[PDB]
Design a protein around this ligand. Structure first.
Ligand SMILES: Nc1ncnc2[nH]cnc12
Ligand SMILES: Nc1ncnc2[nH]cnc12
Lengths: 178, 175
């Protein structure tokens, strides 16, 4: 049944050549999203992996924006709250901020200082693990609140781009690997 | 009781983004373990009370992805992201909307909807309606139909509803 669910999720991810630049094979979640069971089966597969691993978060965090999609769907399945990790300048009350490296330049993410209780074990959700830059900035952000990271889970991991190493010391799951 | 619960988790924040504006902050609603499911359930009740039976949900990047996903799940429907520019990888339609100064765009994949779809737009807030109207227009470039638009919140007097003249508009709460 787990292979079967995983095969369904895999069967809805398109591969798109040369996007956003030449040479990059883009992994496209839109057909998964569009299917009436796509999000639900994805979030149920995520819950199964977490259960297998004994990971029991208290709340879910997602980054702007595809963290919002899968994070909200997973939060629903687990009966948990959700916290947005936003681009800078969007959150209205006091925030923490963490800068991360891009190929050229840098950027930041923020969370409300009060987003997590100090007893929270936070599950980070996102679509795709590549370099792990925004995932690590997310972990740092959570830790600023004094809450603890329960783990990180992705729909997809890109083999060999170093994300999982960047996230050493944290439990990392990914449903599909490319 | 349900609407009151949702209202009670939308914090009022003075002077954001700038002196004078009263910001309506959904974060405490999102953090509550029942905030999103209650919100989605209240939206689904509204749509049944108005006879709107969409075939697919479109959520506006980025807070419409939050409420859109939640409501799509309650409805048993699929979800289409309406995205900021340069994010969707396949052939897209594009529509411009006005910002304070200059403009920006929203995109959808040209294959996101069929001619037979009846699309529900979901977003957190109806303010000027700039983005919501661009979304309607995107939808209509596919020749699918707009079933309706639903928002958590509507800001009274900013003209949003009027910009969306001719479409079925619902908002859970008016501020
Ligand atoms: N190759 C890729 N496909 C889809 N999303 C991405 N985000 C970063 N790299 C990506
Ligand atoms: N006043 C407001 N409060 C919350 N979100 C908004 N988006 C635009 N105006 C807003």
């Amino acid at each position: 049944d787990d292979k079967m669910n995983l095969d369904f999720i895999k069967s809805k991810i398109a591969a798109v050549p040369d996007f956003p630049k030449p040479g990059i094979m883009f992994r496209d979640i839109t057909p998964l999203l569009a299917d009436p069971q796509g999000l639900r089966k994805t979030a149920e597969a995520m819950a199964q992996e977490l259960k297998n691993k004994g990971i029991q978060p208290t709340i879910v965090a997602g980054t702007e924006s595809r963290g919002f999609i899968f994070g909200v769907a997973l939060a629903e399945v687990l009966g948990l709250g959700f916290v947005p990790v936003r681009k800078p300048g969007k959150l209205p009350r006091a925030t923490y901020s963490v800068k991360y490296d891009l190929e050229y330049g840098s950027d930041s993410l923020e969370i409300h200082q009060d987003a997590f209780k100090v007893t929270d074990e936070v599950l980070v959700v996102d679509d795709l693990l590549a370099t792990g830059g925004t995932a690590k900035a997310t972990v740092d952000l959570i830790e600023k609140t004094q809450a603890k990271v329960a783990g990180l889970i992705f729909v997809m991991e890109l083999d060999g781009l170093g994300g999982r190493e960047v996230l050493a010391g944290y439990n990392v799951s990914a449903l599909i690997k490319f």
